[PDB]
């Protein structure tokens, strides 16, 4: 059969900001960054980019944890901009993807 997807563990007992890091350490984070740059650049209109950045201070609070903290944890670990990590995680809702 075709190759089975890698299988990893995520402990929900850990703080949200650290939950995914044990998994990220198995990856060349540049490849995650490269996949974001191709999917984002080829889809997002600028007014959404400004808008989400305009609203990051709100989206962080009214959207339910631990989803916001988990995203912020992986984003800092990868040295990415939270506005983009939130945009990828809301790709379906933005409708532009």
């Amino acid at each position: 059969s075709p190759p089975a997807a890698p299988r990893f563990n995520v402990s929900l007992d850990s703080v949200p900001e650290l939950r995914w890091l044990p998994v990220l350490r198995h990856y060349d984070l540049d490849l995650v960054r490269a996949a974001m740059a191709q999917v984002i650049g080829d889809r997002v209109p600028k007014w959404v980019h400004v808008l989400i950045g305009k609203v990051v201070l709100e989206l962080e609070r009214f959207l339910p944890q631990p989803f916001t903290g988990e995203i912020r944890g992986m984003c800092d670990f990868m040295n990415l901009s939270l506005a983009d990590c939130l945009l990828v995680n809301l790709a379906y809702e933005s409708s532009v993807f």
Binding site: A5, V10, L12, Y27, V32, A35, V39, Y92
Partner: protein
């Protein structure tokens, strides 16, 4: 996308799905199966892309399976208002919230069908007991339709691509017919996860945009399997 929930002659529920999306050459590398642990024990399993915390495919052991397909309905300002002012939650986050909290199949169907969402979606849910298979066509506020299995009347499977099941499928993108033809040829007696993988390997059910195929059965949680396509 394509999601299938079906029941064999023995009363067991099987659930499989293909996740179709462009940018495969980059996202295939990022596909992972994640076992989410509560106090050292597997609370639920999910499939995502590393960097994406929501689950479009998941399993609660011995409770239910969930997968979500795209439903293109409404305008952008409906998602914007639903998210900003009406405080609806993302589509893939409700799937994960359901896998973590819901105590059984019937409870998950209710959580998935009624919790307000920022966008539309098709939720396919599979359980453990007979008849426990349903397609939830979702609106932002609630369910537009609920389509359960009916094995006794011959409807032992449900197939959901990206279109309302009560209207005809676009001839331009008709993967539903191929899935049903393959299911009709497999048969309820030969139904299995392996057989469900073969069905989801049919063209064009398995197409150029398919990134991975997941097959699962909550009643047999150890057989959860995601296979990455033509890397």
């Amino acid at each position: 996308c394509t999601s299938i929930v079906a029941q064999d002659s023995r009363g067991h529920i099987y659930h499989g799905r293909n996740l179709d999306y462009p940018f495969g050459n980059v996202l295939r590398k990022l596909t992972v199966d994640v076992q989410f642990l509560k106090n050292g024990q597997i609370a639920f399993t999910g499939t995502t892309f590393i960097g994406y915390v929501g689950l479009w495919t998941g399993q609660s052991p011995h409770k239910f399976t969930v997968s979500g397909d795209e439903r293109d309905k409404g305008w952008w300002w409906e998602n914007a208002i639903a998210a900003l002012f009406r405080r609806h939650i993302p589509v893939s986050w409700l799937i994960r919230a359901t896998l973590s909290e819901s105590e059984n199949f019937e409870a998950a169907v209710g959580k998935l069908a009624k919790t307000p969402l920022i966008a539309d979606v098709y939720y396919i849910v599979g359980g453990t007991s007979p008849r426990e298979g349903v397609v939830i066509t979702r609106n932002r506020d609630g369910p537009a339709d609920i389509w359960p299995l009916d094995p006794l009347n011959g409807a032992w499977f449900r197939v959901e691509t990206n279109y309302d099941h009560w209207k005809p499928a676009p001839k331009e993108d008709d993967r539903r017919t191929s899935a049903i033809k393959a299911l009709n040829a497999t048969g309820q007696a030969n139904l299995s996860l392996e057989a469900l993988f073969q069905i989801l390997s049919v063209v064009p059910v398995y197409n150029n945009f398919t990134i991975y195929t997941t097959v699962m059965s909550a009643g047999s949680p150890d057989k959860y399997m995601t296979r990455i396509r033509n890397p």
